[PDB]
């Protein structure tokens, strides 16, 4: 246990580095998940009027920190729904990298619009440059979403101690988007049937799904029903329930999303998975 916070960027990477090896993850797992908090405790400070968040986390880093850096596939994005438009999130995060948190200080780039088949609005990207002390210590790509069907009606309080591990003693609240809606989410995502040309490459949700599938308590098995059904019917595509299909180009991408996730009990091939997940879906079907 560290009596004081890292003096520079050298000590926290050391104080990483050593966190790293007890815990048995890879450094820059670590690194990329630490940031990431900053990052939430940055965003934590956007607000509305009753003091309830304008950015909740959602996607893979919203199983990140519900499941720990073991049990989670690697996130590639600080991923949220935003209940306010690009403009004002983006000026208020800047703002509050300036300000700084615990001797970590963020610059923002400007947002981009991204592409996604099957969702009704395209999100923007950006990056926030994260500095320890004035030292350049990580980059986090940032992936912006607009509230759909009422899904940031609703919020989880997530934590972590890996910023306490290293010696920084502040509260970490990451509001997150509910597991049920979550699943709704990933359902429509991991079923939608593309334009021919185009052609769906989600695999990896057929994991996430099973992993969400592990964290949900019966008792809000009828919640995520109805926010099944809200998000299929306001993206106004294909009906719930779904199918959950393969596609031939699948399994080598299955496998990959399995990468380091052996000791868990996930189907073995994407077909498997497949029809796990659809034993999931007919489960919520059932939760009337
Ligand atoms: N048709 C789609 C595509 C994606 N999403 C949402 O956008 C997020 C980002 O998707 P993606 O870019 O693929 O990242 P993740 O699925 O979270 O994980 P990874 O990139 O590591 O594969 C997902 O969590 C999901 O909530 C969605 O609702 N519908």
């Known amino acids: 246990p560290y009596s004081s916070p890292p003096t520079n960027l050298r000590s926290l990477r050391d104080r990483l580095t050593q966190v790293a090896e007890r815990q048995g993850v890879v450094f820059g797992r670590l690194q990329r998940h630490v940031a990431m908090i900053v990052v939430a405790q940055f965003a934590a400070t956007l607000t509305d009027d009753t003091g309830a968040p304008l950015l909740l986390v959602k996607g ?5 920190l519900r499941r720990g850096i073991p049990d989670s596939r690697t996130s590639k994005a600080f991923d949220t729904v935003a209940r306010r438009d690009i403009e004002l999130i983006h000026e ?5 990298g300036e300000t700084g948190w615990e001797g970590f200080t963020a610059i923002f780039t400007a947002p ?3 592409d996604v088949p099957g969702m009704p609005v395209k999100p923007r990207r950006f990056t926030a440059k994260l500095s320890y002390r004035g030292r350049a210590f990580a980059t986090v790509p940032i992936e912006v979403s607009s509230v ?6 609703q919020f989880d309080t997530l934590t972590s101690d890996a910023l306490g591990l290293v010696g920084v003693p502040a509260a970490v609240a990451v509001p997150c988007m509910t597991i049920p809606w979550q699943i709704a989410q990933k ?3 991991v079923t939608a049937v593309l334009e021919e040309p185009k052609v769906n490459d989600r ?3 057929l994991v996430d799904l099973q992993l969400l599938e592990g964290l949900l308590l019966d008792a809000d098995l ?18 719930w329930p779904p199918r959950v299909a393969t596609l031939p180009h699948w399994p080598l991408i299955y496998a990959g999303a399995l990468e380091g996730l052996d000791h868990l009990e ?8 497949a029809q796990a997940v659809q034993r999931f879906v007919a489960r919520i079907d059932r939760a009337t």
């Open 60 to 64: 893979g880093s919203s199983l990140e």
């Open 222 to 239: 009828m919640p995520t029903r109805s926010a099944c059904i809200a998000i299929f019917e306001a993206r106004a595509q294909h009906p």
């Open 203 to 205: 695999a990896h949700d």
């Open 112 to 114: 981009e619009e991204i």
């Open 148 to 153: 759909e069907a009422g899904n940031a009606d």
């Open 266 to 273: 996930l189907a073995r091939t994407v077909d498997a998975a």
């Open 187 to 189: 359902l429509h995502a």
């Open 92 to 96: 208020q995060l800047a703002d509050a």
